[PDB]
Amino acid sequence: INGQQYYIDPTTGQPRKNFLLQNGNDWIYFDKDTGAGTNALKLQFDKGTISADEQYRRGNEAYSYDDKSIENVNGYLTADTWYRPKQILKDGTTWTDSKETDMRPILMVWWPNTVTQAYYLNYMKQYGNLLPASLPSFSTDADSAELNHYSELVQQNIEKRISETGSTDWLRTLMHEFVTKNSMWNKDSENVDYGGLQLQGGFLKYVNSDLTKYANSDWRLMNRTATNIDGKNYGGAEFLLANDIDNSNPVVQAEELNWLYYLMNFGTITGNNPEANFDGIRVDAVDNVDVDLLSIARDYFNAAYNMEQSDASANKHINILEDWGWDDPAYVNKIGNPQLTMDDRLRNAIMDTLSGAPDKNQALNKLITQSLVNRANDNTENAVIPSYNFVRAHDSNAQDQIRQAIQAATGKPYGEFNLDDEKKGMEAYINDQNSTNKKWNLYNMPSAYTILLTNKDSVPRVYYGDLYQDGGQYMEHKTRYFDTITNLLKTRVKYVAGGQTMSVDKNGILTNVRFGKGAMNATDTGTDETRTEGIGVVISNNTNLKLNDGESVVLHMGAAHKNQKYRAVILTTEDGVKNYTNDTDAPVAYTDANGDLHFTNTNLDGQQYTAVRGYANPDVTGYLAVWVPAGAADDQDARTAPSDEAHTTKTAYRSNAALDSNVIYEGFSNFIYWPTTESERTNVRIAQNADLFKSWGITTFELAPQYNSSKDGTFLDSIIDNGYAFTDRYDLGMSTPNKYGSDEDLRNALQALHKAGLQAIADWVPDQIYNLPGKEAVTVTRSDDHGTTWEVSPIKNVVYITNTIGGGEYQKKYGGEFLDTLQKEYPQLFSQVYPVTQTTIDPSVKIKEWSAKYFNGTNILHRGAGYVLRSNDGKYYNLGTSTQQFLPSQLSVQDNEGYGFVKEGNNYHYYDENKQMVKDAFIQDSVGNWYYLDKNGNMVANQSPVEISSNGASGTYLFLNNGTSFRSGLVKTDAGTYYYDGDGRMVRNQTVSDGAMTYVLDENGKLVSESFDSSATEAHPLKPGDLN
């Protein structure tokens, strides 16, 4: 009984918020907070008179407008501002001239309106006991004489408590707790939304303004990715996470080169050790930065390593791209393949045919065609775009599914967890991994890895979490796939080479063949070394596969393999798979004179598990078998060395037998735990295991990003501290260990890898920086991940407090410091003109500390739309440093009386700063609502649509009973339902999205249909193909 009322939306099953229901002259407004219905709106525009008591009035004035007198950010005041008054009412009794240290909250003496003053009183009473807790609530409607009486009493009681406790800490805490309970001062006014790449619930893009000139930029060219160089197209999302670096600013670009050089010379610079440098880069978040960076990195590598000279030259520095967009490969190829594109068409073919559940996988035929490379008869070299490929990665079918397991095991929201939670989720995740029916883990990991590692024209990348359990100390526990995948890896070195043929038969069974080194076509007879090389693969994704009697699967081993003995590498069993790491006790099969192997529904020569049929177990759902020639020498190596012959084209990597001889190891998971001893340190264990990785044929070890985590908990990366979320770009376990160890552990890992003949990859992360400690006022607009204005947000060209100043001691020590050396050693880098900026990089300014001018924007910070304090008509308070000096009445000697919104008779008027009545104009109140004063200067409030032209612009508006322009919501009337946009104007004849909601309005503005996208409402796994 006695509950609230709501209007349940038919598509959300939840209350409509900010929704007006009208029936004749009667109405219910359903509120913003919970959608609870009311028919009594409060007047929001009322200030009410300053202290009539002159001792309070004069005593509470600001001592001065100096920086030290009034807490501020670039001269702007915030809800948290404390200030020095002329006098304090000491111990509640004795007006006393203030000391410099006598700071008091501005909210002790000032409120944006009477609504907030009443709420302040209620709060200070209930939670501060600064009024008798017995008092009834102050209604918004309370007159200013009553409100002022009780805020003066609160002031007395604050001063008594300051005297009795000898402290103001309690008051700092209490006032900030009040602040955060006001929607104008919290996330409720920030239009939280998780659509697209709003991973943290929304962005604020930085814009130029006379209000914040020190934060202006001539650059901020956004979304300028591979398919949007000129900005005339859509491009990738500029915005992703945290503070988005403006990589279109030429000074920032020089700094990215500076950092790049630092990474590539890390051991030299920090350890006097040229044996402890990185050899290549991974470019993080490619489709979220100015694509100029690909050419800047290219140019540096060309200058320092002469990449384009030959294959031997390029292959000494394997670089890779995190480039998700399906049109990226053509562009990467065009600029010279300076970093390897991924082949996302190929990975998605694997996802679609092998990695899903039995009732979900598609026909295997797609593996032949859906890729940068057609593999039906891949018999040529240097003919395709070179690329790398993978089955999983730290952020690909790992982090989202692991968070799903944690959520399932703990009941906590997606992404929220402590270390105990993480371990409990990991136990469930690993139990799932070892099940036949998997909820969170990919199926057919053995078959997926077989395709990965036997494909021609591909640099495969192995994922750490497929060899070792994702969560645990580094390499603490092996997965069930460790033996299978390391068997494939060693077999790949020894046998996998030459041409490829892939086919799928009428039973949907896939056959994959490699001929061995020296043979490219099925008809080639090969060389001496070809004979005991090559591989044959049989794959099905059909758990019910049954061949009729007399039906066979034929592997066409080719003309180099006539009348030859083969032995098994992997066979599928009832319970899993069997691995054979060499010829000993492996089952055998013989080719005929055409080079064909013949398998059927029956074991060959009484050898267990040589029949082809469907299985369903935790390894295989379908069928897998792999065969190689018997009798290879123990030291057989089918790989090809890169030629040092001069390139005839302007390319680094070429897709050929030498590039194919490389394997990348992504040597981390996000869910590595912090080590409990020095011995458990990831980089310590990497150094100790260099020869192990070599034995798998790893040629480049991709290390995690080594940057010390911000540990701010604002994204997964700064919860599990993987190194992608950092404040100091140059701090690689240097001020304190990273999760992987100290900078000495890192240099030791690089040196040990080099000693074993492996390369090491530096994760280059130019997109963003986290957790800068210095505040800066910036003019911003709430925007989507492409910087498109969020139409329903009031945050449009609004001053907001950002955290953009800082960068740590190592950015300060090293930022810009290698530019002079780079200019003298590689001068050509400084005269290149880049395609997006159409200019050179700009090394004339060193970045030693970041500030807002260098960023495109920020994730929303939950400070609230109105945190920066304003009066009526959009006017900002300011000390006078960033914009016109203007202080609240209570702090100045100016009297508020008769200015702003004023009642006369049954009407309200608005008087401007010259005390003149405003007519036929829109005017904003201090908390951001909008009003229209008509031709007579009367506030409009008739809740029936009204046509207004304001500066040659039509609009149909609706003004609620309290005068406020209704906006960003629906109105249901007797005649239909209507939608008013973020500017208060009725929408007609279109489809509009309002956050999670989509509404279709006909020519008359009537709602025809609506839909709900729940994923806009909270953090969520990113949908497959979201980023293609």
Ligand SMILES: [Ca+2]
């Ligand atoms: Ca960006």
